């Protein structure tokens, strides 16, 4: 799963 800040 991706980190919270991959935005």
């Amino acid at each position, epitope marked *: *799963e*991706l*980190d919270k*800040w*991959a935005s």
Partner: antibody
Framework: RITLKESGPPLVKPTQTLTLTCSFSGFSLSDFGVGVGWIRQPPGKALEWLAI???????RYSPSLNTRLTITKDTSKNQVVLVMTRVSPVDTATYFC???????????????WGQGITVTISS | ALQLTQSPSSLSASVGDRITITCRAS??????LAWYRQKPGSPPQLLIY???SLESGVPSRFSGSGSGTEFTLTISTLRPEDFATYYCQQLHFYPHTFGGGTRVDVRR
């Protein structure tokens, strides 16, 4: 600025529960996006990621530990707590809690660390 | 999960030396990679955040570059306080992985 300090028992018996507390100042868990993580390091070994909790409360644990870890935060105390169950000698290490910046780019790192608390597991 | 391989794992050098160490990931982590220096008995200390940004307060001799699966940390001129162990960490995927570390000691 920001400083953090780990506290808890230096000695824990195999099987028991290890409760760790991270007290910090210079930031609060209500600032947007801010996180606090836990990193451990066995004697003479590499750093190992344990878990992280954020301002809005989501948290993540290391897959290979997650049925043994519980991370929480009390915001009036400005502390984060980590509970590790059924510890064994292999859990003997130095435990660090660290701060992670929230979006104002540079959220890509744990910028300030505690000094660490070394915990030894023995009966 | 994501494997971060640091190399060389051990390195021997002298004050005034220029060294470059690497950390590479099994999957692309974009620019979410940080570098730390850890001296015996002390906690890790942030040098580089977001792969190439020098952390405020960190000496200019330290620099980082890379993106995706390849990253490097370079020390333009080795100082006494640099003989320590260096670690990289990616914060793009959970769990946040640390490399195995790079050990820099004094050459003789």
């Amino acid at each position: 600025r920001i400083t953090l300090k780990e506290s808890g028992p230096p000695l824990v018996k195999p099987t028991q529960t290890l409760t760790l507390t991270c007290s910090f100042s210079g930031f609060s868990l209500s600032d947007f996006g801010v996180g606090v993580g836990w990193i451990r390091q066995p004697p003479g070994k590499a750093l190992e990621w344990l878990a992280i909790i954020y301002s809005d409360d989501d948290k993540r644990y290391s897959p290979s530990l997650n049925t043994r870890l519980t991370i929480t935060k009390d915001t009036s105390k400005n502390q984060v707590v980590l509970v590790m169950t059924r510890v064994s000698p292999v859990d003997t290490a130095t435990y660090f809690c660290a701060h992670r910046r929230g979006p104002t780019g540079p959220v890509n790192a744990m910028d300030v660390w505690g000094q660490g608390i070394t915990v030894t597991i023995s009966s | 999960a994501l494997q971060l391989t640091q190399s060389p794992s051990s390195l021997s050098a002298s004050v005034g030396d220029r060294i470059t160490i690497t950390c590479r990931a099994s999957q692309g982590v974009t620019s979410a990679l940080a570098w730390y220096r850890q001296k015996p008995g002390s906690p890790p200390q942030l040098l580089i955040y977001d792969a190439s940004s020098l952390e405020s307060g960190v000496p200019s001799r330290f620099s980082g570059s890379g993106s995706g699966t390849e990253f490097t940390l370079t020390i333009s001129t080795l100082r006494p306080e640099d003989f320590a162990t260096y670690y990289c960490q990616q914060l793009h995927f959970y769990p946040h992985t640390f490399g195995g570390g790079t050990r820099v000691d004094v050459r003789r």
